[PDB]
Amino acid sequence: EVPDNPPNEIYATAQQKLQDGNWRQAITQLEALDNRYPFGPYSQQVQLDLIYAYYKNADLPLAQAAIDRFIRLNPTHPNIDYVMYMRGLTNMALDDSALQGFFGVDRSDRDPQHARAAFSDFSKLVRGYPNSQYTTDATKRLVFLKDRLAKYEYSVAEYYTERGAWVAVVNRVEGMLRDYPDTQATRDALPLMENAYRQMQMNAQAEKVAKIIAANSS
Amino acid sequence: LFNSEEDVVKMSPLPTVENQFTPTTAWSTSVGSGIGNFYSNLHPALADNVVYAADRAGLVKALNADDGKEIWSVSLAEKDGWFSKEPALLSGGVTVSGGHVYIGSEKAQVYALNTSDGTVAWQTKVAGEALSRPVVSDGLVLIHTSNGQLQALNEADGAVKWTVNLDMPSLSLRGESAPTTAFGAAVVGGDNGRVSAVLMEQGQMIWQQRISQATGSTEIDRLSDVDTTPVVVNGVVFALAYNGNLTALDLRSGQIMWKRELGSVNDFIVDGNRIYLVDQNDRVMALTIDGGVTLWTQSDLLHRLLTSPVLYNGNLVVGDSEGYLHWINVEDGRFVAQQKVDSSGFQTEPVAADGKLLIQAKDGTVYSITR
Amino acid sequence: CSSDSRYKRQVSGDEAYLEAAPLAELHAPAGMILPVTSGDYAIPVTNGSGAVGKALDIRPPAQPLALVSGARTQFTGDTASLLVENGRGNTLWPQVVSVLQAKNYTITQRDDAGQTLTTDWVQWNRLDEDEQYRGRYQISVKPQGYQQAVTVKLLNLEQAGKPVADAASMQRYSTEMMNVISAGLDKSA
Amino acid sequence: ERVVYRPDINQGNYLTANDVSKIRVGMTQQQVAYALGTPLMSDPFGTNTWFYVFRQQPGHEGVTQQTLTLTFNSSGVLTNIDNKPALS
Amino acid sequence: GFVVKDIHFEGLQRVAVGAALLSMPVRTGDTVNDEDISNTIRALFATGNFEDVRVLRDGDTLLVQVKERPTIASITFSGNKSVKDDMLKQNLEASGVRVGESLDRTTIADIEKGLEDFYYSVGKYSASVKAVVTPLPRNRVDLKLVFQEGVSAEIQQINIVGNHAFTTDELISHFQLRDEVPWWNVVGDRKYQKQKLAGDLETLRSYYLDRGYARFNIDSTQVSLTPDKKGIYVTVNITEGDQYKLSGVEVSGNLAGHSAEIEQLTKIEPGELYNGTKVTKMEDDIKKLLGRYGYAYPRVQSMPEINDADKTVKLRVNVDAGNRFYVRKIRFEGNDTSKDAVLRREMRQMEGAWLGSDLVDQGKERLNRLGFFETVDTDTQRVPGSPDQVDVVYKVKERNTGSFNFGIGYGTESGVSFQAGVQQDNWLGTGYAVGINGTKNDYQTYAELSVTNPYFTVDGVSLGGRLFYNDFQADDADLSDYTNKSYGTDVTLGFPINEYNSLRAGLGYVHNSLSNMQPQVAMWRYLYSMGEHPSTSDQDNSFKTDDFTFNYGWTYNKLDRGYFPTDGSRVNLTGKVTIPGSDNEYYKVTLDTATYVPIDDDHKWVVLGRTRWGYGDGLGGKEMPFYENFYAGGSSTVRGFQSNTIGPKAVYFPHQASNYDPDYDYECATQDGAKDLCKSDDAVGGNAMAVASLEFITPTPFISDKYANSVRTSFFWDMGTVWDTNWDSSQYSGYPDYSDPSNIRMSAGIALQWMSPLGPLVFSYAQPFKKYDGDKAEQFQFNIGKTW
Amino acid sequence: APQVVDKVAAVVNNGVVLESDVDGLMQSVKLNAAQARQQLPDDATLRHQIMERLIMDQIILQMGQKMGVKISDEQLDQAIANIAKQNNMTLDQMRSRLAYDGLNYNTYRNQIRKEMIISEVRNNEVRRRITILPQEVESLAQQVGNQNDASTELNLSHILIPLPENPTSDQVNEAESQARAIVDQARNGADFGKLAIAHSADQQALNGGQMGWGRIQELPGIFAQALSTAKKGDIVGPIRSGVGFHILKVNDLRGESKNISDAAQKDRAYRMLMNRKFSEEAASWMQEQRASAYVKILS
């Protein structure tokens, strides 16, 4: 698949295939460069292009591995903000689905692990590099991921309200108030907390939650 | 699964020789199943023109040296049927002395059969598998068990007179070193590569000295086993270790005199001012005693698993794994003759005494070679 | 199977996150407090402005190759610098000039005394862009310690007859000119 | 009318007459937590109050609940004990 | 003494000129002698990056010629057969040799030896290794390691010294390491592994302690090689001691008020033999009992007080329950598709409640029984900085719960034709069970939809609905041929009554309309029972019936899993009875059974007993409609027979067909050539049915564990019979007695199941060694979807 | 045209020999030969032995570096006594080094450091290899009796034809033929010194193999039995001792009937026993190191 031409010609072919838009042959060429010439005038450029091509080709695990190795090998690289942005993007990408999205399914009830990891990476990027070129999109993605996590917690609290586990409902809504205070899911969950307090005949706490709802729903 | 996927081709071919004489088989007699495929020390014993032979399960047999006719036979395999008929797992080789026939066993038993008819005068339990050849001297029978313990059974009644511990490595070569009489002492080898000397009275250690280079990386490269019999001559001890050095040591002080990268687990011969040796690669060699200089070497039998050499009629004799007996001139490596004796291989040492050469094949057939 | 020219330089997503509702704080009623926030999911207020969604170019930042023997190559805002070694000396400037003459670029200014030059316009035939960029460049060679060093800078970039000053585009087409220079120097050697 | 299997919904933390009899006013929060265990429920709206709720809903047999409210002061010293052994 | 005007480097490929210059004693300055050049060369080599270094002078210019140590382009392991490339590759990487790294030729021998060492660790002591260095164009090299693997070392003997209570053969029979391999055990070997000797020694210790030997001790163990190193000897020196009896077990410590039950767990028959595994099981049982009450982390340690003089052992068990743990959160990981509530509603452990662990295991087995996940695991993690709380995390791997069926029949020969169907058990991770089926031809149309919500109420009440449509009328009605048009709806509601039992009740409606039926004994008998009096000499007739039915059912399910179960039994009873008001009256009931019994502790070898029963009949003077009849045979009931072929066969009265083709392709009772009642091979089914099957499930021999969960192989023996209870044997004495149930068909063969991307696929080859005249045989059968 | 200034002549265990070392010893040996009147052979045969001596020197130097052995300035001050022959010619400066290298200081000082370090590590390793037995000392002392028997003192020239520790028979007969040919040439009238410079693996080859004046008992025994029967100038055939074939020439001899009057004879006998043991163990260990070490001559 990969001939034995010097690194210059392999890199030229890889760049040509990336510009054309074919990720698989370009992936082959950059992998050949990385494995055969791990040092030289092309190093790190090959790894950045590998990350980009893995992301665009939906090879998310390989993109994560490449990003991890690049981060742990070149922490001082000037373009490490791009690497962290790509880490956030590939973690958010692992949080999506095709068929469910096609059918308009709300996926906030599913596993939030990848959303949590993406939030962590994007927060790292934004705090470490405020002036980066990707900071605005990173902030928008953080606002979305925060809303998603609050919605997951709301789904769990709603289920436990249905089941009749009032301590679990109160704890879940308290965790929402302590973690995602400013999300819409928290505003929707507060009535669940008030109902859970009342069902356990803790009227003083239901009164406090009702005061909060009256003071803010307006 | 697949029987056609594993094989290593590292065996020398049968050399062509012009025999200066015609080897002959005076007589042959079957002795049980024999050693078999198992690695053992069992071999005949010559005493007062009587040939004593044994078997892995045990078929102790006495045969005439002149015509292999037998005078008495016995079986030591569950004579009283304590449990079915279990094999005795004899592997000590026949020892003969004072009208007694001593044999070891891998069940940690030592038998001391009688000469007149085979009656078991005594049987003693020992510290472990009695792999070593029993050594009779000073009224004691020395055994060297597989778990690294030198015991000295009493000759008369088999009571353990004393015991000595020897270090045992995590891995070693099957077999044990037979002590030497020396002068009121016992010079023995060990699987750890340290030659030791112990007084005959009790187990007071006299000296110990390392013989193996053992500069390896893993266990298989540190196989320093001294499985040969140290040879005492004029107050110097000759020892030979596997993947180690052929060294000479002071009998009492224990300091080495000279060393040579030569290893083997087959007993060597010290005759006059010469040392006949068979290395671990089946390379017959001749050295001198004062210093190691390889007087001559032969490699035509290389990697043909050979038995220990024996000096017979002024020439060296060695068996091979295919049943061929080879004669070698002492002065030079040229083969003096060659013969086919048995289809089953020869593993255990030949016996050369009283102008008679005997061998035992893996199948248990005792052969006498003449002329 | 089916594909579009813009699948490149685009986010592998639906861009739905731009429609997420904004976050609003909760007011604490009188006589009580709201639970203390953990601060684990706090979003700092950054005032920066930048491209979002499909308008953000995620193509990897083009880093100078530094083909000819060198180190500590860099890409500035609108300029790029490459440090060379191996005893080039004053001979560096002729080679650079020859390299840019091999590209038959429209060199407008040639000040050999100052080791400087400037061109009118060069175009790039990239399969990656939906519209081809073009830029005006100035190249020079100056002494540093033991040896000379080359520098390439862009006066401006243009698309479809109008100027553009995006940082990513400037970086990309300065690494482009720097790679051109380095490849020419390596070929000459 | 509701003839379908429903599992037991246990909620809160286990309370025993001995444990509830071990706590007394003046106890610090560490001692109370040692005697009764970590509470699964506290007051997050600006008070040092611990709620020990003991719910048991074996099925369709009817729910029972014992709630023990412990009000501490700013220093962490137990100030008031309110034990309700049954629902209203 | 000369001024260095310039320094020029030649041959540098990997080392940057800057690094080399930093590695130089020279600074392009001046005041340089010959010795300075020599020291420069020595320093460059001391860096360890160069194989050859040279310095030349060209006037006032310094030309440095360096031959960098060539770079490894590729490493090819050729000839290795037992050690796999990835393993050996990792070992060589660990040794410091990898593609791109400069090849220090002063160590090739070393790495060769290292490889041999690894083979030694593999049990191949007489193995040889050689390195071949092939020069490439860009001063790179390919390092091909040629391997000559030696003959493996085999165990010639395993010896135990000091054993008098048990013979050596019995003791070593339980060992993994084996001296002799039975002639019939072709898959066995005499290979020696250190980890196995360690486990065999532990096995011997357990055997001796389990037969009563508190003082058993292994003095030592020896492993030896034959000089040629192709044989291995193992010796174990042991000390039996003597047999001991139990005097009593007394428990002490903080029992947390559970002394009565713990003491009931520690019961011994006075004077019984000591037993180590029994003591371990008592410890484990006490731990489990404490865990049931929330004591997740107790300390239970048993020490035996031995009495050598009396030779009796008294066990002292110290128990400290500790704190009662509470659950803080229950988290689910890996449910990328399944909705969170789908997993959470199977939990028996509430989130904010005291721990019991029995409930956690119950939730785990509920999730496994669900069938939506390939693997389910549980992890109880202590909350950091909390002495009384834990988090329960369930990690799941999702399956392909759907299955697809597709095909095309006659094609474009007559109009168009196709067949399709989909069945999902976790539609879009919502937990809904959805299913669509359809077929189109010029001779038939069929449609069917089914949607079930397993949790219509939080407690588990399920609500399901079904629609179906079926037609046999030809397009444009070319001629009055046999036609059967039906449709109907069915609504069902189910609810649990135990952890394993559930009931179902529902209402169904079905409309049927047959016309131009061929006169035959069974159908005409049923029609007469209905009161109809159709003609027998001609094929023109019609019949229409609306039916309302009450459906009931009961399912017991305690299977190990929802797919490829290895334990447990499942029973499913279904039935329907017509509501008074229907055009015809009858009742019907069916009963399916499937039991799994494992034979191996790993559940690899299983025995499956499957069964199916069915009976139906009329209530008044009516009879069960012939379109509700039972059918047997096929990949679902009795493999080796054509689908729906077992059972009574149609008997036709002489008559004239509505059409007369010149091909003579008409039933035997056609009026043209026949004038007497004649039989046929057309299966019509019966109102009574009984099927059974016994399967032995074995591990697939030629697949690794990575696919073990995906493939199942079994050997089956099937029996089955169908009969018509109302067959008037008094008449029709010249034809087989279809009312006799003794005509039992049997088959035996091999079946393979694969969880393919299109759902389950089942292949089977069956010989029907017992069959009766008229039965159609089909040895090789292929099917898609859940079978039975 | 470009002129080569320096290059690597040999690669050894992580070390290199430079062409400025081969040339230095070439000039040294040429100067000694010219002063000694002993003509020396063609560039290449002299080059092979010099390269061998440099390989052995580099090996020993790297062993010293590995083992943490270093040399003091006072050691250089002492070596100035004999290495520079200041006792014979009364001048301190490097102007005595008129032959080559332009009277430079650093070069000859480093050369002396190289010799001291080699000698030190050689002595340490050989001494740590020696085993002395009281019985042998008693035997040799009782041999040192009857008017100091064998008081013969000899100045000899030695040639060693090397063989590996584990040689093949092919190599054995090759070495045998070589040794017999050298012996035949020496006995037929060929100058032994010229033969020694051309044909010898010993360290003393570059010096022509001269061992200097010694006492017969100091011989490792391998030579004394044959050597007791020999006149001035005789050639002794090939022998063996583990390291290869040995050839000896009797350059000179001098005997006297002096007797030292045991109390003071035991110490002297121990001294001579140590001398022989050091000579033999030194040869054995230098042969072992040569076989073991990594080397790749460069051309």
Short mmCIF file of N, CA and C in Angstrom, two decimals, chain F residues 82-122:
data_model
loop_
_atom_site.label_atom_id
_atom_site.label_comp_id
_atom_site.label_asym_id
_atom_site.label_seq_id
_atom_site.Cartn_x
_atom_site.Cartn_y
_atom_site.Cartn_z
N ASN F 82 61.29 7.58 34.92
CA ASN F 82 61.67 6.49 34.03
C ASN F 82 61.10 6.62 32.62
N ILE F 83 59.84 7.03 32.49
CA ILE F 83 59.24 7.17 31.17
C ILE F 83 59.97 8.21 30.34
N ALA F 84 60.30 9.36 30.92
CA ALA F 84 61.09 10.35 30.19
C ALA F 84 62.60 10.13 30.31
N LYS F 85 63.06 9.13 31.06
CA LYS F 85 64.49 8.85 31.18
C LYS F 85 65.25 10.08 31.68
N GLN F 86 64.65 10.81 32.62
CA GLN F 86 65.33 11.97 33.19
C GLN F 86 66.57 11.56 33.98
N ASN F 87 66.54 10.38 34.59
CA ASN F 87 67.71 9.90 35.32
C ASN F 87 68.90 9.67 34.40
N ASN F 88 68.64 9.25 33.16
CA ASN F 88 69.71 9.05 32.19
C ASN F 88 70.16 10.35 31.54
N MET F 89 69.22 11.23 31.21
CA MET F 89 69.52 12.53 30.62
C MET F 89 68.91 13.63 31.48
N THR F 90 69.76 14.53 31.98
CA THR F 90 69.36 15.49 33.01
C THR F 90 68.73 16.70 32.31
N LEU F 91 67.44 16.58 32.00
CA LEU F 91 66.62 17.70 31.53
C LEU F 91 65.14 17.42 31.71
N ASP F 92 64.44 18.41 32.27
CA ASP F 92 63.00 18.28 32.51
C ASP F 92 62.06 18.57 31.33
N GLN F 93 62.39 19.55 30.49
CA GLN F 93 61.48 20.01 29.44
C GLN F 93 61.33 18.99 28.32
N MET F 94 60.38 19.27 27.43
CA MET F 94 59.95 18.36 26.39
C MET F 94 60.80 18.51 25.13
N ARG F 95 61.80 19.40 25.18
CA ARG F 95 62.80 19.52 24.13
C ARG F 95 63.58 18.24 23.92
N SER F 96 63.62 17.34 24.90
CA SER F 96 64.25 16.05 24.67
C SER F 96 63.48 15.23 23.63
N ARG F 97 62.18 15.47 23.49
CA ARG F 97 61.35 14.72 22.56
C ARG F 97 61.51 15.28 21.15
N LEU F 98 62.77 15.32 20.70
CA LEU F 98 63.10 15.97 19.44
C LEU F 98 62.51 15.26 18.22
N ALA F 99 62.17 13.98 18.34
CA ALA F 99 61.88 13.20 17.14
C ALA F 99 60.62 13.70 16.44
N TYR F 100 59.52 13.85 17.18
CA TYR F 100 58.23 14.08 16.54
C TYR F 100 57.29 14.75 17.53
N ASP F 101 56.20 15.31 16.99
CA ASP F 101 55.16 16.02 17.74
C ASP F 101 55.63 17.37 18.26
N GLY F 102 56.71 17.91 17.71
CA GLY F 102 57.08 19.29 17.99
C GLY F 102 57.27 19.62 19.46
N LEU F 103 57.76 18.68 20.26
CA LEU F 103 58.09 18.97 21.66
C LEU F 103 56.86 19.35 22.47
N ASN F 104 55.69 18.84 22.09
CA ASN F 104 54.47 19.18 22.81
C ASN F 104 54.41 18.46 24.16
N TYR F 105 53.72 19.10 25.11
CA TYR F 105 53.61 18.63 26.48
C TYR F 105 52.41 17.71 26.68
N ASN F 106 51.23 18.15 26.25
CA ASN F 106 50.00 17.43 26.56
C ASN F 106 50.01 16.03 25.97
N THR F 107 50.52 15.89 24.74
CA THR F 107 50.50 14.59 24.07
C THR F 107 51.26 13.53 24.87
N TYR F 108 52.50 13.83 25.26
CA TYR F 108 53.29 12.83 25.98
C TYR F 108 52.76 12.60 27.39
N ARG F 109 52.22 13.64 28.03
CA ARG F 109 51.61 13.45 29.34
C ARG F 109 50.40 12.53 29.26
N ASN F 110 49.57 12.70 28.23
CA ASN F 110 48.43 11.80 28.05
C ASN F 110 48.90 10.39 27.71
N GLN F 111 50.00 10.26 26.96
CA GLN F 111 50.55 8.94 26.67
C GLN F 111 50.97 8.25 27.96
N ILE F 112 51.62 9.00 28.85
CA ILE F 112 52.02 8.43 30.13
C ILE F 112 50.79 8.06 30.95
N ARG F 113 49.77 8.93 30.96
CA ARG F 113 48.56 8.57 31.69
C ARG F 113 47.97 7.27 31.15
N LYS F 114 48.01 7.09 29.83
CA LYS F 114 47.51 5.88 29.19
C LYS F 114 48.27 4.64 29.64
N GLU F 115 49.59 4.78 29.78
CA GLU F 115 50.38 3.63 30.22
C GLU F 115 50.16 3.34 31.69
N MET F 116 50.10 4.38 32.53
CA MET F 116 49.93 4.12 33.95
C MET F 116 48.57 3.48 34.20
N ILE F 117 47.52 3.98 33.54
CA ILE F 117 46.18 3.43 33.75
C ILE F 117 46.12 1.98 33.28
N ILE F 118 46.73 1.68 32.12
CA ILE F 118 46.72 0.29 31.67
C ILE F 118 47.46 -0.59 32.67
N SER F 119 48.62 -0.13 33.15
CA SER F 119 49.42 -0.97 34.03
C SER F 119 48.66 -1.21 35.33
N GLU F 120 48.05 -0.15 35.87
CA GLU F 120 47.33 -0.24 37.13
C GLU F 120 46.21 -1.27 37.04
N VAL F 121 45.35 -1.14 36.02
CA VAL F 121 44.21 -2.05 35.94
C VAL F 121 44.69 -3.47 35.63
N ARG F 122 45.72 -3.61 34.79
CA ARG F 122 46.28 -4.93 34.51
C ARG F 122 46.74 -5.59 35.80
#
